[PDB]
Amino acid sequence: KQTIFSGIQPSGSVTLGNYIGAMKQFVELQHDYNSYFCIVDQHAITVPQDRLELRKNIRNLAALYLAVGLDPEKATLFIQSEVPAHAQAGWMMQCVAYIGELERMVSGLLTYPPLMAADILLYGTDLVPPGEDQKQHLELTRNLAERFNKKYNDIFTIPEVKIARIMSLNDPLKKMSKSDPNQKAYITLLDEPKQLEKKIKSAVTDSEGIVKFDKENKPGVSNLLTIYSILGNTTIEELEAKYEGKGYGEFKGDLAEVVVNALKPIQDRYYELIESEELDRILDEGAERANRTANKMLKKMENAMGLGR
Amino acid sequence: KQTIFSGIQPSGSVTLGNYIGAMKQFVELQHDYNSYFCIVDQHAITVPQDRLELRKNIRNLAALYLAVGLDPEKATLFIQSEVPAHAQAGWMMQCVAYIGELERMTAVVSGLLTYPPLMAADILLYGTDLVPPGEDQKQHLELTRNLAERFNKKYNDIFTIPEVKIPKVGARIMSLNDPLKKMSKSDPNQKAYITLLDEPKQLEKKIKSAVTDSEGIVKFDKENKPGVSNLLTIYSILGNTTIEELEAKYEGKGYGEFKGDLAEVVVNALKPIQDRYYELIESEELDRILDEGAERANRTANKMLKKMENAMGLGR
């Protein structure tokens, strides 16, 4: 059973687009793969942060992950910061990484990649996700892994990166993104039904009046068919067949409700957890698991380098 | 009342200049200060090492400090890596330090440029009031004070701002060999230095062949008679006698017995240290003392760590 590590930044709120990109894809692999989801709060402080926004974002993200079906008794969801081994191994890896490598991509900004390498390597990670802009982060990680294996002990497995792009409702050519100035460009998983509906019905389209798919010729309608597709558990072409004698108004109206119904259980559950202390227990349990495992790999690192006794 | 934090490198061998310079002086402040002696193995790995000799030096240093009169009941002696908060706080301090101030001190290994915030973390973690002076610790301490103040201001106010404490005129001890040089273990001539574990026989050999003058007067003046005044300084401190008594004592006498007598004085000073070192170095009582100190340090350090985390928004 291969093992996967996903480093997940607590950055406030998840768009539908990114839920469909990563979240959904990797949450489902929890039964076939041994899977870790690490809220990387120590990487978040490499940029300016309000202390309150940060604790808020961390809880919030944890709640969503569980709300979207992550099973804490099969996968390991935890907060980086609560597993001291990360900083510890993070520091040993600083003593193996060179500056040159790091300048080629505030101090923690320049020197978090060794800590990132440490995040993945502490767990014997076989696989990492394709976070857009991780192509050079994984390369370093791989390299640092190889450099430590040669110089001390083969203890690290060399991690691999093994694999629907949701575009803006306002502009089909732009990717859906939380930082989009226009609030109607994107849907967040906690959007209320009322507002969910509004954003879909005003989503830019064509005039052709025919629900059909081609990306570079009907990008707005194509995108909508792709959302409908994933959230509704159907194929695009079935949907074409289904809207044969129909126009965008019925389509947009039906899609609205599909989306409301796909997000209702997720919301319902978010709010049960966000307030509960059950959420804290889950996170306590996750940190215990990760420490138990991360500490074994740490001691080896320490023994490989010679740090105690 | 005041607490001192002494960060001490496990480098494999300690000269006489060190015992009299740092160790002795700061192990004496033991009762009038809550004093920490931290074996900084995570600073050690910024430069190349053999995992065997590093492990060895770590014990060696622990054993030496005890052997020299460090009281595990009054001072906290511990290993840096064995208290995780250092790594944790250190990482937090990297998120406060800018690259420039770090770039203004030293493809090279990253932890060699980025250790100063970890040094900051080491000290600030204990609410340290005072620190020893080191060779090039001036520029290091200045950065720590900045990071302390920068963080007090921006997040919460939790760090005390530390100060260099100057000990009771620590004597700088010079080579036996070239008296203008400072005593150093790296010198390629083992005659030039004396280490606390030198056998009485090698102690004796080295002292007799220590560089002097062509006068044959045992008289202290630093600029014209550096060999002799270095030895007088050594005789003074291990002797517990003033240089004046030693000029009195060695009036109508020449370098012959001056070196003979000093030799026996050094042997006798180093004997208890050696007998005691050789008990601890093999026994498990040492391990017990290093477990206690790690425990004490962790309890203190973890409280401050919680404050830093609350102050920045990590965890819950």
- If asked whether residues A141 and A228 sit together in one domain, one would say no
- The C-alpha torsion from B9 through B15 and B17 to B21, rounded to 10°, is 30
Distances (CA, A) of B214 to A163, A289, B254: 82, 73, 11
Amino acid at position A59, single letter:
R
Backbone torsions φ then ψ of B196, nearest 5 degrees: -50, -25
Q: Strand locations in chain B, DSSP E?
A: 3-8, 34-39, 75-79, 130-131, 163-164
Q: Strand A160-161 relative to strand A127-128: parallel, antiparallel, unpaired?
A: parallel
d(Cα A191, Cα A16) in Å, to the nearest integer?
A: 10
Which of A114, A101, A162, A123 has its CA nearest to residue A141? A114
- The helices-and-strands tally (H runs, E runs) of chain A is 14, 5
Residues B34 and B147 in one domain: yes
Check whether B178 is labelled as a binding-site residue. Answer: no
Residues in B 166-195 with any Cβ partner in A closer than 8 A: none
Rounded distance between C-alpha atoms, residue B183 and residue B148, angstroms = 34
User: Is there a single domain that holds both residue B270 and residue B293?
Assistant: no
Q: Where are the alpha helices (DSSP H) in A202-306?
A: 219-232, 236-242, 248-275, 278-305
Same domain, A183 and A141: no
Please name the residue of chain B whose CA is at the shortest distance from the CA of residue A99: B110
Resolution (A): 2.8
Neighbour tally for A124: CB within 10 Å: 17
Question: What does the block give as tokens for A111?
Answer: 């020197």
CA distance B236 to B265: 10
Q: Is A226 helix (H, G, I), strand (E, B) or coil?
A: helix
CA atoms within 13 A on the CB side of A51: 11
Task: Name which of A95, A116, A143, A148 to mutate to probe chain B: the one with the most chain B Cβ atoms within 10 A of its Cβ.
Answer: A95
Co-location of B133 and B203 in the same domain:
no
Asked whether the beta carbons of residue A55 and residue B79 sit closer than 8 angstroms, the reply is no
- Domain that includes residue B227, residue range: 173-283
Identity of the amino acid at A171: D
B152 & B5 share domain = yes
Is B136 marked within a binding site? yes
Judgement on whether residues A299 and A268 belong to the same structural domain of the protein: no
The answer to whether residues A133 and A140 touch, using CB atoms and an 8 Å cutoff, is no
Q: How far is the C-alpha of B17 from the C-alpha of B182, rounded, in Å?
A: 8
The length of chain A in residues reads 309
**C-alpha span between B220 and B218 (Å, rounded):** 7
Q: Give, in degrees to the nearest 5, the angle at Cα A114 between A112 and A118.
A: 110
Q: Find the CATH number of the domain harbouring B211.
A: 1.10.240.10
User: Around B99, how many Cα atoms within 13 Å sit in the side-chain half-sphere?
Assistant: 11
Q: How far apart are CA A25 and CA A32, in angstroms?
A: 12
Do A69 and A149 reside in the same domain of the chain?
A: yes
Crossing angle of helices B116-124/B138-154, nearest 10°? Answer: 70
Question: What phi, psi does A161 have (nearest 5°)?
Answer: -115, 95
CATH code of the domain containing A79: 3.40.50.620
Q: How many helices (H) and strands (E) does chain B have?
A: 14, 5
Q: In degrees, to the nearest 5, what angle opens at C-alpha B18 toward C-alphas B13 and B19?
A: 95
Decide: A273 and A265 in contact? Cβ < 8 Å.
Answer: no
* B35 DSSP assignment: E
Q: At what angle do helices A135-151 and A113-121 cross, to 10 degrees?
A: 70
Output the furthest CA–CA distance in chain A (Å, rounded).
Answer: 76
Residue type, B175: S
Please state, in angstroms and as integers, the Cα–Cα distance from residue A151 to each residue in A75, A83, B41, B49, B166, following that order: 33, 26, 18, 11, 41
How far lies A222's CA from each of A238, A248, A295, B186, in Å? 14, 12, 49, 73
Neighbour tally for A151: CB within 10 Å: 11
Pinpoint the alpha helices (H) of B85-125: 85-94, 99-103, 110-113, 116-124
Note whether B179 and B307 are same-domain residues: no
> In this structure, are residues B259 and B210 in contact, taking their beta carbons and an 8 Å threshold?
yes
Q: Quote the number of domains for chain A.
A: 2
CA distance A142 to chain B (A): 17
Q: How far is CA A264 from CA A228, A259, A271, in A?
A: 16, 8, 11
| A259 and A295 belong to one structural domain | no
Cα gap A23→A15, rounded to integer Å: 10
Q: How many CA atoms lie within 13 A of A34 on its CB side?
A: 10
- Please report the number of interchain residue pairs, chain A to chain B, with beta-carbon separation below 8 angstroms: 143
**Alpha-carbon distance B93 to B87, whole Å?**
10
B213 and B299 share one domain: no
CA-to-CA dists, residue B173 to B16, B19, B141, B163, B219, angstroms = 8, 10, 24, 25, 17
Beta strand A34-39 with A76-79: parallel, antiparallel or unpaired?
parallel
Angle, helices B85-94 vs B116-124, to 10°: value is 120
Both A48 and A189 in one domain: the answer is no
Tokens standing for residue B139:
């520029």
